[PDB]
Design a protein around this ligand. Structure first.
Ligand SMILES: Nc1ncnc2c1ncn2[C@@H]1O[C@H](COP(=O)(O)O)[C@@H](O)[C@H]1O
Ligand SMILES: [Zn+2]
Length: 258
């Protein structure tokens, strides 16, 4: 943690193989104006001023705590943040637009970051089949900007952070059936997660730079979890109407009927 001018934050990393959250702290310097925007959020350039422990900021009460205490690792010595967010790193911070900040609760920040980590595992499962192009999803973290005056409201300011992508950012499909590029690997990764999960999930909203992807969305047949972008059977079926499995689908031996 550098003594340089910045702001403090509580840092949250999710580890799927142990299925627990890792609680940390960091200092960061955010630019005043955003450099890009989506439908719901704005993105800011940020520089890391160091990652440390959370010893100075106790959780206090177990009751009403989210995420719950049983989902929190008691040891935080190992994590991705210490290398990928080390002092000097340039990264990206994302805030919700006001409005609709009204549709962003504390649970949805953690649910969104857990969803990206889940998609990150599917990328590794995809890469084990040795496709022509390997895909990879970026890390993602929840950060509580504790130095910023709470929404009033009375809730602290939350955000998500992730590594910086350098290059042309392109969206390949949406979360409701659009096919926006001629590339085969993004659609085939979608034709892949739906079949290999036995139709329990599909990963769409495949976007990013080259084969580094971020901000995916998951549909599940019951429509539960994975945020408000989970359109259930409708989202799954909408992908099937516009999908043509391709040479990558064929190479992965996916079923041409869905
Ligand atoms: N990791 C990233 N690195 C650089 N630019 C990004 C990144 N994520 C999102 N963006 C930009 O921010 C915009 C908003 O993305 P979204 O997160 O979908 O609202 C995108 O259209 C990109 O131009
Ligand atoms: Zn396919």
């Amino acid at each position: 943690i550098s003594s340089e001018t910045g702001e403090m934050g509580i840092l949250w990393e999710f580890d799927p193989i142990i299925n627990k959250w890792i609680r940390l702290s960091m200092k960061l310097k955010v630019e005043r104006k955003p450099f890009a925007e989506g439908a719901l959020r704005e993105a800011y350039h940020t520089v890391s001023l160091g990652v440390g422990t959370d010893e100075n900021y106790p959780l206090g009460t177990t009751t009403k705590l989210f995420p719950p205490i049983e989902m929190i690792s008691p040891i935080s010595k190992n994590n991705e943040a210490m290398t990928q967010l080390k002092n000097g790193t340039k990264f990206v911070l994302k805030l919700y637009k006001k409005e609709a900040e009204q549709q962003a609760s504390r649970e949805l920040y953690f649910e969104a970051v857990k969803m990206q980590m889940v998609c990150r595992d599917w990328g590794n499962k995809f890469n084990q089949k040795k496709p022509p192009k390997k895909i990879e999803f970026l890390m993602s973290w929840v950060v509580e900007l504790i130095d910023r005056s709470p929404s009033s409201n009375g809730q602290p300011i939350l955000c998500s952070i992730e590594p910086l992508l350098v290059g042309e950012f392109k969206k390949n499909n949406s979360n409701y059936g659009a096919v926006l590029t001629n590339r085969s690997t993004p659609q085939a990764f979608s034709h892949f997660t739906y079949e290999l999960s036995n139709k329990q999930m599909i990963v769409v909203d495949i976007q990013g730079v080259d084969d580094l992807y971020t901000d995916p969305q998951i549909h599940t047949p019951d429509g539960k979890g994975f945020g408000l972008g989970n359109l259930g059977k409708a989202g799954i079926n909408k992908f099937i109407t516009t999908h043509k499995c391709n040479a990558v689908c064929a190479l992965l031996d996916l079923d041409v009927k869905l």
